[PDB]
Structure 1
Amino acid sequence: NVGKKYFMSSVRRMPLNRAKALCSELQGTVATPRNAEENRAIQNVAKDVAFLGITDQRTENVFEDLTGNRVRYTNWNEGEPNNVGSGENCVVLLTNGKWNDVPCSDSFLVVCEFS
């Protein structure tokens, strides 16, 4: 927890569409760090690489949260985002806390955020 936000991690891996459904089921959303403190809190609850609620699906290289709000704070791993291969429009938080853009169809743990 950070301020009014609570972060919980999943135990199993799944693609972002399913991750979204899971957090939405309990009326939360996929975790979106707004500052370094929240980034650390999310990293701490995630025991492995996990999805964040950030994507550039609507407009390439324009990252926004799942409610359409452009993100301000970012913590990209060196070399990212790189939209490699056929494209990478979702975002995961690596085990060192930095971010990587990855295919939304790939599976990772999910960290959900509740307020």
Structure 2
Amino acid sequence: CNTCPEAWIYFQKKCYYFGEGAKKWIQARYACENLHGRLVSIHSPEEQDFLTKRANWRGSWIGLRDLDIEGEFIWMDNQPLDYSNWQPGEPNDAGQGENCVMMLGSGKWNDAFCGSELHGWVCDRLATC
């Protein structure tokens, strides 16, 4: 079962959407839902490698946030915190608070101001048959 909707990209049981266009994190959440997916959740080095190689060099939102309880990150897929790719020193909750996670151009993760208008955002879905 490796079928994905038109414009999505298949990798290891999942489908990925490389969205482009300036969006705050919440806007990217709903942009993914409009396409019947969610902001991407990442659970292995192989999945991260797929994303790193394809990531927007200006940065992109992923489906990870600590809005509800500071320091408690939650994935869009509600699965465990079982794989990380933090940029060294991140997350750092800089400014007066950074509660939404992005990939840098290198694929490394950074917590950012949720109102930042990033030019990329990545969604996922399970592949169908």
TM-score when normalising by structure 1: 0.91
More strand by percentage: 2
Which entry has the higher C-alpha Rg, 1 or 2?
Answer: 2
| CA deviations over 1:32-64 (Å, ceiling 9, x no partner) | 111111112222332231111000111111111
| 2:76 is aligned with 1:62 | no
CA contact (8 A) 1:33 1:42 kept: no
CA contact (8 A) 2:67 2:99 kept: yes
Taking the aligned partners of 1:87 and 1:51, their CA distance within structure 2 comes to 16
CA contact (8 A) 1:89 1:102 kept: yes
Classify the secondary structure of the residue corresponding to 1:43. Answer: helix
Classify the secondary structure of the residue corresponding to 1:13. Answer: strand
Q: Percent identity?
A: 30
Taking the aligned partners of 1:52 and 1:89, their CA distance within structure 2 comes to 12
TM-score when normalising by structure 2: 0.82
Match of 1:24 in 2: 33
Match of 2:50 in 1: 41
Give the unaligned 5+ runs of structure 2.
Answer: 1-9
How many residues end up aligned between the 2 structures?
Answer: 115
Taking the aligned partners of 1:65 and 1:44, their CA distance within structure 2 comes to 21
**Structure 1 ranges of 4+ moved more than 6 A:** none
Q: RMSD over aligned Cα, in angstroms? A: 1.4
2:24 paired residue among 12, 15, 18: 15
Q: Mean Cα displacement is larger for which, 51-60 or 41-50? A: 41-50
| 2:128 is aligned with 1:110 | no
